[model samples]
Target: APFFDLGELKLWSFWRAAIAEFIATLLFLYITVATVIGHSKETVVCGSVGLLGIAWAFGGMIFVLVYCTAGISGGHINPAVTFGLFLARKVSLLRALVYMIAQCLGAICGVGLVKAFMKGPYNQFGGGANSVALGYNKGTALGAEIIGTFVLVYTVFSATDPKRSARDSHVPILAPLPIGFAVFMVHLATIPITGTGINPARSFGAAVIFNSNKVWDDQWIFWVGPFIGAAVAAAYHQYVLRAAAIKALGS
Candidate 1:
């Protein structure tokens, strides 16, 4: 095992956290992506759950899963969340790698499991896979993902900051509200454009299950856009905001 101070891969704590991430991500994708089947009466574009319900699915799952797993694996169900924390020095290189692997594999398995049970609708509606929509171009899709992920990762940093976590009246109940709402709000804004792939693992998972050339073609946007947004968000939060406060104290 390659050892580093940032995160030690050989440790039981590391493996435990990685396992939590894998399970959380699998469950997250299974339920949430299932909700995005566009033609279902209960979950179509304008059905009962509609766009709003789908958003809640993504956000609510994050809130609950994070509450459940934060102490374990930092509850990073999304690779974008993992990457953002890595860049911010909140997580280690080893931990980020392990978490991303767990997340991606978990996502693929989740979609496959659902496909096994519901192959009919799953195939018809692209298996809830994301692609650049008809009205929009790749550039537009990229912009939407970048901005959307910025909001999500930014809210994540804000939510978990030690300064804020200490003062919270509702530590368990409230810490995740802003984070969930950020996911919900971003989905509300970007669902129509690129089906809202603020999470690269999400996009990649669906594409793998659907095995479609089109969704794969646009797959780079989900990974690239979220990563770029996450880097910027981490930089802004740490180097600008956090650093400014430190500099003020030194001055």
Candidate 2:
């Protein structure tokens, strides 16, 4: 088989990638918010599927999006992921900026649509945004996001490394399972603190719609922490892991 480009679309003009990012982010937020509104509202005590359910929802969505659009857009549903890729030199600066903007806009649009659907008092739900006061103090909350994003980015680099495992050559049949499980773990660990915002778009959507300063006040942590963690993972994968794989393959 010919060695086709993994992210050829990323090399295109930033505008195209931005558009794709916007659309993907919107879909992600829309589905998640819809799920929360439809399921959580009916039950008492925030029953609407809870944290684990939300994590599953996110993981499932990411898996679907990765397979569906990764060929065309690289399936970067999160700005933190994009930033990490940039740090790893896998993505260009221009592309990263465009993707980040697209992701944020898409998130905003998704939450905006959710608001439209539940026009009444239901809007108060705020579409499940992240926060620090939820018991994960600033440090703990940031740490969780960092660790969650680190694992996610690390898995991504590992899974996609052609030299590491034959499985990395293509999207794995069980890709969704591990990816979903990772999100579930993140939620299990951090839902109480920061609401598990490994993805900045997820956090932004909720904060924007809720119009709450609390969400925004701590939003930087989500971006900073996740980006840092992801960058570290990307560096480790690209520099350390890839080098080791090359040597092993040479042998």
Candidate 3:
């Protein structure tokens, strides 16, 4: 199939899947951002959800959303993961572009909903936007984002492998567990460094709502690094791990 598949536009299932992505991403951002704001507003060290709980919030929400929408749109709530799949030729360029747009719109609307209810705390607590913490330079932040997203995209590929699907036919429910764990584990490692923006949709949503100068300036890292990481993951899985290039050339 060609990259630009105009036929997909006429498929009702295509639009339905895109809607699933939109709704899933919207809920993802809404729950995760609210959790962050709650944690930030707490005065005590043990107040609110804490960093550990915030990690859980992200991971837990992803676990639920992916499970719910897996059959619908492949449950790609993150633009980075979608980019990886697109690179691997799992999705056409048209669907990829549409999905990215729908995810971004859902993200913005989700964050907007949070702001509507908690306007004061939302701005006061930095709008849950991803940024480099104190002492970390842009280079470090970019590296963190790249590596973090690589781990996520890599996990996604592994989880969705055809071999795994074949073997786990009876226990397919466990597929999303590792992905959710990947998100949780990455957050634990990169939260203090770059606020763990493995998902571009998550970062873009918060950045747009926050509209802060520093976030916009550092925004390139969130987008560029994740895309690069996803690209690398896709090539690694398709060409190296799967030996797809060798099979193609030999065949």
The numbered model that scores best in TM-score is 3
Instruction: List ranges where model 2 is wrong by over 4 Å.
Output: 1-16, 44-50, 161-177, 243-251
List the global CA lDDT of all models.
0.77, 0.69, 0.83
Q: Can you write out model 1's per-residue Cα lDDT over 33-80, one digit (the tens) per residue? A: 777763353544454666778889888988888878766666678899
Best by lDDT: 3
TM-score of each: 0.87, 0.80, 0.89
- Over the stretch 39-80, how does candidate 3's per-residue lDDT look in tens digits? 898888786878999999899888899878776677889999
Mark the regions of model 3 whose C-alpha exceeds 4 Å error after superposition: 6-10, 161-174, 243-251
- Rank candidates, lDDT, best first: 3, 1, 2
Clashing pairs in 2: 40-48
Of 2 and 3, the candidate ahead on TM-score is 3
Please write out the lDDT profile of model 2 over residues 155-193, one tens digit for every residue. Answer: 666545333221222211223345555666776776667
